[model samples]
Target: GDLVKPDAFSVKIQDWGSTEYDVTLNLGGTYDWVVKVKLKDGSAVSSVWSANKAEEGGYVVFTPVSWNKGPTATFGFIATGSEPVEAMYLYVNDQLWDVW
Candidate 1:
């Protein structure tokens, strides 16, 4: 399932693990990206990892720099565009999770 906001991006879980998961991001334009993960219990998990800024293209790859040690939970990701974008896509472990 994809969550598309009027102006915000969407996310999908491609490959999940205890420590990390592979994710992708689609932006209307080239911009810096960020992601947030939370547990099913509503507990927020923070990561030291960040996505590399997109150079050219709507879809970009976002890899976790560091992951928190814990169990897997129903998680969600939120992405923001540096500027107003027209479209974006996120790929998690080569799987398309979001399209906008």
Candidate 2:
């Protein structure tokens, strides 16, 4: 879901093709917003969610949600996961910024 007043975008996962996926995200500041983690519930694969790292923004110091099926996840804060990201998009207060 797209967030209004969005200034940063973040995500944590092994993307959309791998199992044993990790969760991660980035981009945020003093802005009101929300997020939802999209998971593949079909015969593709699954995501094993766990808190890795996060930074300032709103809140959500991820309480390590693991060993579950669907986190149906939503959260605050922004963490960096170094891998393949196709740009989790959004913009800043004035400047149009694209984050991945």
Candidate 3:
């Protein structure tokens, strides 16, 4: 899995074989978005991106999940292991234009 260091202000998610996953936010305001991934067991992984350092359109965050395995497994987010895996995705809206 691709991981970013804690000190990084922005990360190029595209370089990690990631793609843009368009998302609409209902907060009614625009600001830099943070992409994150969560597991069903309530574990989470997150990355932050600065507006100036973000890619041209932004990209979606994703992780693989596996059955009977913890967050360390390489499978889509699903109920796995004793904790049960759940994947979560979130994006921040930094654009001034409405996605609708």
Candidate 4:
């Protein structure tokens, strides 16, 4: 069963060098899902580089692009059936520095 609701999730921000931060979404499960992240200033992050598949909107929409296959699978964007997803990782510029 899906352990997370469409609107249920949390965001964690971590330092990624000096001009960017790692934005991680804890979606609570391992299901096929997408997440939208926006800054407090009503602007989206620019140059969002993720190994996973994602789209840019008023913010950013992140989606899993792969799933369990082998030990070398890129789990960052992988999903587990309809399980609600576990996490999503992305990078954003320092423009979002104080917006998190």
Would you estimate the TM-scores of all the predictions? 0.28, 0.24, 0.21, 0.34
**lDDT on C-alpha atoms for all candidate structures:** 0.33, 0.32, 0.27, 0.35
Backbone Cα, N, C clashes tallied per candidate: 7, 7, 12, 5
Candidate 4: segments with Cα more than 4 A from true spot: 1-10, 15-29, 40-53, 68-100
lDDT score, candidate 1: 0.33
* Candidate 3 lDDT over residue span 9-36, tens digit each: 2212221222322222233333343434
- Which scores higher on lDDT, 1 or 3? 1
lDDT of predicted model 3: 0.27
Model 1 TM-score (2 dp): 0.28
List where candidate 2 sits over 4 angstroms from the true fold.
Answer: 1-10, 15-28, 33-86
| Cα displacement (Å) at residue 95, model 2 | 2.4
Please provide, for model 1 over 2-98, each residue's C-alpha lDDT reduced to its tens digit, 9 standing for 90 to 100. 4432333433432233223333333344333333232233222233244433223333333433342111212233333221222345433344434
- Tens-digit lDDT track for model 4 on 6-93? 3333343433321233444433345454444443442234334443434566444655556622122222222222223223323222
- Among these predicted structures, which one has the highest lDDT? 4
Cα lDDT of model 2 by residue, 73-97, tens digit: 2333222333322333333344434
